[PDB]
Fold Mutant alpha-1,6-mannanase GH76A.
Amino acid sequence: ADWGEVAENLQEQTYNIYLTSNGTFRQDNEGNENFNYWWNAHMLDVLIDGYERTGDESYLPKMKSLLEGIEVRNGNKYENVFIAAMEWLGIACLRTYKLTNDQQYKEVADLLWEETKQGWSDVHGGGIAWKTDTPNSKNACSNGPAAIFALYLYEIDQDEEDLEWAKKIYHWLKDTLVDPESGLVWDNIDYHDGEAIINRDWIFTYNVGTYIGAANLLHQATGEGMYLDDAIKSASSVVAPGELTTGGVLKNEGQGDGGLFKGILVRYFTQLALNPDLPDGKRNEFEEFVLFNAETLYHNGLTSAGLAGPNWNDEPSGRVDLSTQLSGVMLMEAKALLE
Ligand SMILES: OC[C@H]1O[C@H](OC[C@H]2O[C@H](OC[C@H]3O[C@H](OC[C@H]4O[C@H](O)[C@@H](O)[C@@H](O)[C@@H]4O)[C@@H](O)[C@@H](O)[C@@H]3O)[C@@H](O)[C@@H](O)[C@@H]2O)[C@@H](O)[C@@H](O)[C@@H]1O
């Protein structure tokens, strides 16, 4: 079984176990049919991964049923009070539009982009708010994805205003939430009792992952070497022993939201690994890091059926949330893409 076949087996198991009403995916493989908007946005990204790997046109109807189901199970609308939810679906919509030219995806993305920009304010000097409800909380997870969103939109529409947005968001993110020594990414800045407080304890895989993804896309959009340097510094900190790994493997971040975090990192990490201006030596290091994570999950973390747990070193003994399964599928599709 080569890495493409492993990826296809995890795509099949995910669809089989989690497919529910309206072509959307359920919260867990046990008693929870809750609709989780951003988790289903990452399921769309996973189906696109399968389509790109296979060229199999049977993915396209699955993608379209999921796009339409999200609107139904979110209450017959695409708006969400969580701004990052709208950013993650926007990214998947523009990715699909680039591959299929299906205008329905572009129209949903255009809507979600207007809502995302409304979240920007000069509180803490910039940044998109986490929620339409929490305008003091500026979070890495509502900024890194907004920069990626703007860069995908720039690739499609070639409007200078979208590149301006990407640069402004990235500049604020790097000036506020990026460790200048490591290039790892702090979770948020918020007010408490008159003080601006940065949460430096919460260093999560997906926040450094979207910073790496934005930096990689900015390098490709501008040619400015500072962006590729930033991406390489952050990625080198992900591979070197430290906060995000245990025994050379991306660490257990629990289930729920945290279950998706590692998958997002692997996706953009892998995109940096495919940048043709990346030095050959760094490319070998990054490709080997992805392979050892993929091998670890395949041999030690996956159940016989092909469900991944939060710990890629251990099989899960009970419930597996969709988020956790998606991280597993994203890892295998990234490995298959590097082959
Ligand atoms: O114990 C808290 C939390 O800790 C870790 O996550 C860190 C994370 O928390 C915050 O954001 C969570 C997500 O918010 C948005 O999704 C909204 C989504 O949340 C749940 O899935 C449900 O309530 C859904 O109904 C709802 O729509 C979005 O921004 C997403 O990207 C976020 O991850 C926030 O403080 C972040 O800055 C921070 O990174 C994990 O252990 C987690 O499982 C845990 O609950």
